[PDB]
Design a protein around this motif. Structure first.
Motif, mmCIF file in Angstrom:
data_model
loop_
_atom_site.group_PDB
_atom_site.id
_atom_site.type_symbol
_atom_site.label_atom_id
_atom_site.label_comp_id
_atom_site.label_asym_id
_atom_site.label_seq_id
_atom_site.Cartn_x
_atom_site.Cartn_y
_atom_site.Cartn_z
ATOM 1 N N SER A 88 0.908 -1.193 0.059
ATOM 2 C CA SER A 88 0.084 -0.079 -0.015
ATOM 3 C C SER A 88 0.961 1.048 -0.010
ATOM 4 O O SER A 88 2.116 1.325 0.454
ATOM 5 N N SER A 89 0.364 2.362 -0.668
ATOM 6 C CA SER A 89 1.115 3.438 -0.814
ATOM 7 C C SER A 89 1.293 4.430 0.489
ATOM 8 O O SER A 89 2.392 4.650 1.146
ATOM 9 N N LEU A 90 0.294 4.413 1.305
ATOM 10 C CA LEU A 90 0.240 5.203 2.498
ATOM 11 C C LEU A 90 -0.541 4.198 3.707
ATOM 12 O O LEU A 90 -1.519 3.776 3.306
ATOM 13 N N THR A 91 -0.024 4.243 4.651
ATOM 14 C CA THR A 91 -0.722 3.358 5.927
ATOM 15 C C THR A 91 -0.564 4.132 7.144
ATOM 16 O O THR A 91 0.259 4.860 7.493
ATOM 17 N N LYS A 92 -1.570 3.857 7.998
ATOM 18 C CA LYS A 92 -1.745 4.478 9.286
ATOM 19 C C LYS A 92 -2.121 3.406 10.357
ATOM 20 O O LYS A 92 -3.227 2.719 10.135
ATOM 21 N N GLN A 93 -1.075 3.011 11.159
ATOM 22 C CA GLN A 93 -1.534 2.168 12.311
ATOM 23 C C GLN A 93 -1.894 2.440 13.422
ATOM 24 O O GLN A 93 -1.434 3.563 13.764
ATOM 25 N N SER A 94 -2.890 1.979 14.000
ATOM 26 C CA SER A 94 -3.413 2.093 15.452
ATOM 27 C C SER A 94 -3.808 0.829 16.052
ATOM 28 O O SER A 94 -3.776 -0.298 15.498
ATOM 29 N N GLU A 95 -4.187 0.892 17.371
ATOM 30 C CA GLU A 95 -4.677 -0.389 17.986
ATOM 31 C C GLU A 95 -5.901 -0.860 17.316
ATOM 32 O O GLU A 95 -6.083 -2.125 17.552
#
Ligand code: OQQ
Ligand code: OQQ
Ligand code: ZN
Ligand code: ZN
Lengths: 351, 351
Positions: A88-95
């Protein structure tokens, strides 16, 4: 009728095992190679691709992946996060999960795999990058274990899934024995039908991978199948089986489209001019239909000419080679000569 | 044992004929479609490609094209000049032959086809460009007739070839009735096993092609096969059979790699989004193995994903469609209902 899930070990040699997984849609002989379906007792679906094109809800509208692909036997799907993080080009990880250019959470991953209709469902995990510091590997593994519990609960909430499919948990912990142990303990407390070794084949190299397998596989329940994700070359498979792995998942398909054929004497690049007059089949012992009929010279000619047929013949051969490898592994374990097979395999493959 | 060459007409309807060519390596049912071999009763070899890679002498060293390709039935080869003139970067034409970036002459073309080991050998001709003035078409056709005699003599000089293969002459003359007649007369005086209509499918369009066939095919010997070179779409085939053509040679293979499938309702582009949820097979009546098992939706998915498998399934279907078309043509002529078949075919194909 076959059970939802039943793994039986028929024979052992050292840490190596051979046996069967019985599921409603068929029996899976182990150790097993599981090829991509769009290229065997079980094939892999591509969760990441399918969730984007045509989408999981569209696959379900079309009758599920078995009907879609024309394959009525078992299908395994990954949980999608490995591929999101890789491609994927942009990712944002969280709980909660991973957002990317979509939110993929444990609950949504399980639901996607339900809509696809796969038989072996992977928990939604985080494949820790390599190298990782102990602190980062621990925090990552701990999140994966929380996500493994959420995956378990989501799977159990869907009657059709809980009654007809199986759920595998994924061990993390990078290269650290203590974290691998904590991960195995957490997974066993939740309870899964099978256990994967995750977080390997991510740049660590074979020596380090084998060192981690040496201590990691014995931590998993002995009476359940062990799936090494992302592996691998024929020599990786043999060594992983020696260390207690039962299931393997891409290289034969990728290699077939890029000119590389697997043989008992090692890989060859069929485009090389040394094959232009070679009348032998791709491999001298292979029983596949390509090797029954056509020469290296003709396959070389087709690939050099840009003919799709050449790549397809290479791929058919490579898939068949892998399945012959797995059959020889199963037979040699069952006969008590796997240690000798591994020695003979390596001597010839690397000669 | 079968003869070197024997054409028998079993049934006729108007100018259309159905029958068989018997050769040492097999029987060819006519009207016949002859697909490229690297994609049937006979396949086409690619003289131009093979003479460059690996070279004709190398093919002979490897045992000939039948052994090389794993095909023991008849093979037809073109004489190579059409492709030299279409694809080569620089060309120089003379009475001796064509030089290009190599000299290809009638004698060398026949020798190349001998080294390849093909069963039906084409005379070395010049495919006159379209449009052509009467003067240019005449001078070109006259050179082709001199080259046809040289081709005959070269073929007859090679015992293995003269005794086991067949030689076809190629009519030229552009769109001009008088030149087509002179060409047919010259070819019949030399004497060939079959006769091709050359110089068409070069930009003139179907109406003009059919007009030229209307007067040109009756000029050829009735008791020998008639091969229309370079044709073509399914509707071109039907109309050419109505005009006395027995043999046809690429579009189904090219189309299959570019997303186009042939159906009794016309061609479709499977990449179009309208097929993403279409559960029907590529064609509703097709008996091919692709249509027995997989949907338009799945083939669409594979091609859109860039999977080689998608193009190969499309190609298999397209080749099988063409062969079902030829079988329906042969059966309808033999039953005296070909005129009706052609009418029904067109109404549905163009609906
Ligand atoms: C290449 N190395 C590697 N691949 C890994 C994978 C992907 C497995 C996969 C996914 C999709 C396909 C498809 F071809 F069918 F599409 C095939 C195989 C992992 N997957 C998860 N969930 N956790 C991991 O820790 C992990 C580690 C992995 N190391
Ligand atoms: C496309 N139109 C066209 N193609 C024509 C061809 C080529 C036939 C051929 C060659 C090689 C292959 C291969 F695929 F097998 F490679 C397939 C088909 C002609 N050939 C000769 N000799 N004279 C002609 O007057 C003539 C007219 C032709 N109009
Ligand atoms: Zn093989
Ligand atoms: Zn079909």
């Amino acid at each position: 009728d076959r059970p939802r899930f039943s793994f039986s070990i028929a024979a052992r040699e050292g840490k190596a095992r051979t046996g069967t997984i019985e599921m409603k849609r068929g029996v899976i002989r182990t150790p097993a190679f599981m090829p991509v379906g769009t290229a065997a007792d079980i094939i892999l679906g591509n969760t990441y691709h399918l969730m984007l094109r045509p989408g999981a809800e569209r696959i379900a509208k079309l009758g599920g992946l078995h009907s879609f692909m024309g394959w009525d036997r078992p299908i395994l799907t990954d949980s999608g996060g490995y591929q999101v993080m890789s491609l994927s080009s942009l990712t944002k990880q969280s709980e909660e999960g991973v957002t990317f250019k979509h939110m993929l959470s444990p609950e949504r991953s399980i639901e996607i795999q339900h809509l696809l209709g796969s038989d072996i469902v992977m928990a939604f995990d985080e494949c820790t990058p390599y190298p990782a510091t102990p602190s980062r590997a621990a925090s990552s593994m701990e999140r994966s274990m929380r996500w493994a519990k959420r995956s378990r609960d989501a799977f159990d909430s869907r009657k059709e899934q809980a009654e007809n499919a199986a759920l595998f948990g994924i061990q993390q912990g990078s290269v650290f024995e203590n974290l691998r142990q904590q991960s195995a303990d957490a997974l066993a407390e939740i309870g899964f039908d099978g256990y994967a070794v995750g977080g390997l084949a991510v740049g660590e190299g074979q020596d380090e991978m084998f060192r981690v397998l040496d201590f990691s596989v014995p931590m998993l329940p002995d009476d359940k199948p062990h799936y090494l994700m992302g592996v691998g070359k024929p020599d990786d498979i043999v060594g992983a089986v020696e260390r207690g792995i039962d299931m393997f998942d891409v290289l034969p398909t990728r290699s077939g489209r890029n000119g590389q054929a697997f043989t008992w004497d090692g890989p060859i690049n069929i485009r090389n001019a040394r094959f232009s007059e070679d009348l032998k089949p791709l491999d001298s012992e292979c029983h596949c239909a390509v090797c029954q009929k056509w020469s290296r010279a003709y396959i070389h000619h087709l690939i050099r000419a840009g003919e799709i047929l050449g790549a397809m013949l290479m791929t058919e051969h490579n898939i068949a080679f892998y399945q012959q490898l797995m059959q020889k592994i199963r037979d040699s374990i069952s006969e008590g000569r796997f240690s000798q097979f591994a020695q003979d395999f390596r001597a010839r493959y690397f000669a």
